[PDB]
Ligand binder design. Sequence first.
Ligand SMILES: OC[C@H](O)[C@H]1O[C@H](O)[C@@H](O)[C@@H](O)[C@@H]1O
Ligand SMILES: OC[C@H](O)[C@H]1O[C@H](O)[C@@H](O)[C@@H](O)[C@@H]1O
Ligand SMILES: OC[C@H](O)[C@H]1O[C@H](O)[C@@H](O)[C@@H](O)[C@@H]1O
Ligand SMILES: [Ca+2]
Ligand SMILES: [Ca+2]
Ligand SMILES: [Ca+2]
Ligand SMILES: [Ca+2]
Ligand SMILES: [Ca+2]
Ligand SMILES: [Ca+2]
Ligand SMILES: [Ca+2]
Ligand SMILES: [Ca+2]
Ligand SMILES: [Ca+2]
Lengths: 150, 152, 150
Amino acid sequence: SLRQQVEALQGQVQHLQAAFSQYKKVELFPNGQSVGEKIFKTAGFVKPFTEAQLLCTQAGGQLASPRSAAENAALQQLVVAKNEAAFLSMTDSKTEGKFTYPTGESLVYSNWAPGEPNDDGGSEDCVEIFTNGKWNDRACGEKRLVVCEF
Amino acid sequence: VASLRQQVEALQGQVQHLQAAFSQYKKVELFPNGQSVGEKIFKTAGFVKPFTEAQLLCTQAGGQLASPRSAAENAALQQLVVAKNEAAFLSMTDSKTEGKFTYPTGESLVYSNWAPGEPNDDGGSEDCVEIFTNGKWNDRACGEKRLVVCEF
Amino acid sequence: SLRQQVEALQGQVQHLQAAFSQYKKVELFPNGQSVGEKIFKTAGFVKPFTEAQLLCTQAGGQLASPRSAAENAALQQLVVAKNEAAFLSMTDSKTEGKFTYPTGESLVYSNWAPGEPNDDGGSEDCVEIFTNGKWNDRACGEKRLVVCEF
Ligand SMILES: OC[C@H](O)[C@H]1O[C@H](O)[C@@H](O)[C@@H](O)[C@@H]1O
Ligand SMILES: OC[C@H](O)[C@H]1O[C@H](O)[C@@H](O)[C@@H](O)[C@@H]1O
Ligand SMILES: OC[C@H](O)[C@H]1O[C@H](O)[C@@H](O)[C@@H](O)[C@@H]1O
Ligand SMILES: [Ca+2]
Ligand SMILES: [Ca+2]
Ligand SMILES: [Ca+2]
Ligand SMILES: [Ca+2]
Ligand SMILES: [Ca+2]
Ligand SMILES: [Ca+2]
Ligand SMILES: [Ca+2]
Ligand SMILES: [Ca+2]
Ligand SMILES: [Ca+2]
C-alpha cells in the first residue's frame, strides 16, 4: 500500500502545484514581474531611497537589482506600467564613482543612459531606472517608485 | 525497505503543512481585488484602460480578459465591478462578424446577461462588451476606457 | 522502482516549499503582516465599520482582532505604513461598556489609549487603532482603514 500512498500523495502534490501556479499568476498581476527565479514587485508608491530600502529588507527581499538585460527588461515593464521611474538597490556612497549592490559587490551589469552616471550636483549616489529602461544616478533623497525583488 | 516508508511519512507531513499554509494565503491574496469562483479566478488591476490595452495586460500576465461563462461567474465578476464602482470590459467582441459575439478563441457565447435592448451596436461602432455594477452587459466602443479585470 | 517514484515526489515537494516561501514574501509586500499563525492585510482604503466588516467576512476572514502585544504591533505596522487609523473587529454594541469579539467572548487583550473607551457623545461602539498602536472607541459610522485578518 506504500506505492498506493505515493500515488495518492503525488496526485495531491500535482493538484497543489496546479493551484499554486494559478495563484502565482494572479499574485503578479498587475504589480509584479517574474524573470528566471527572481520576482519584482512594486509597492505602487514612491519613497526616498532609505525608506524604500528598508521596506524591501523588512519584507525579506531587497531593492530591485537587475543583473542582466533580461532582468532589466522585466523591471522596465513595471516602471512603464506604473509610469514612474524607480530606485535600484545600488549606490556609490562608499566610494564615489563605484556603484555596488547592498553586499558590496561591484556591478555585473549596467544600463546607464548616455552621459550617466555624472554625479550631477556633486551628490547623486543612488540609481533610478527610467521608463525606457536606462539608468541614471540620482540623489538618494528624491522620491522614486518602490520596487523590491524576491 | 522501511527507509522508503519513513520518507513517505515525512512527505505527508510536509504536504499537509503546504496545503494548510496555502489555504490561508489563497484568501489573503484574493482580498480585496480578486474573486474565486469554481476553478476560475478574476483579478482586477484597479484601473481603467481601452480594450486593446486591457487585453494585452491580461494576456501578458498569462490570463485573459474576464470571460464569464455562467451566472455564477458573472456574479463573481460583478462583485469586483461593484467594489471598484467601475464598469469593466469583458473579453468578447463581434469585431470579426457584426452581431456575432465570440470569446478570444472564436467560440460563440455560452452565456450572456445583456441589458434589455443590447447589444445595439450604437452609432454602428460598438464591438466590445462592458458589465455594469448591476451585472448586466452592454456592447460598448472598444476605444472607451473601462475597469481592467483578468481571469486566470 | 518505488524508490525512484518517491525520489521524484521529494523533488517536487522541496521545490514547492521554496517556491511557496518566496511567494509568501511577495504577497505580504506591502500590505500584509504575518505574526504567528495570523496574517493581517489591509485593503488600502477606508470604509465605515459595517462595510469593512462585510468585506472581511466575505473574503473568508474577519476584521483585525489583535489578541496580544505581538499581534497589535504587527497590525500597528500597517496602520503606520498607510498613516490611517484602522477599525478593529470588537464592539460593545450588544452591551454598552462591554467590548467583545465577533464571537461574543470578552477581550483577552486590550491596548486602550488613556481615558478610553469613553463612549463619546454616548455613541461610540466600535474601536480604532492609532498609528501609536493605542485603541480608541469610535462611532461605527466613521470611515477607517480596512484591515482584515486571516
Ligand atoms: O540626475 C540628473 C541627470 O543626470 C541630468 O543631469 C544634467 O543635468 C544633464 O546631464 C542631463 O542630460 C541629465 O539627464
Ligand atoms: O452603449 C450605448 C447604450 O446602448 C445606449 O445607446 C443609446 O444611446 C440608447 O439605445 C440607450 O438607451 C442605450 O443605453
Ligand atoms: O473618540 C473620541 C475621543 O475619545 C475624544 O473624546 C472627547 O472628545 C474627549 O474625551 C477627547 O479627549 C477624546 O480624545
Ligand atoms: Ca557621493
Ligand atoms: Ca555618486
Ligand atoms: Ca545623473
Ligand atoms: Ca462592428
Ligand atoms: Ca458590434
Ligand atoms: Ca450598446
Ligand atoms: Ca452603545
Ligand atoms: Ca460604547
Ligand atoms: Ca472614544
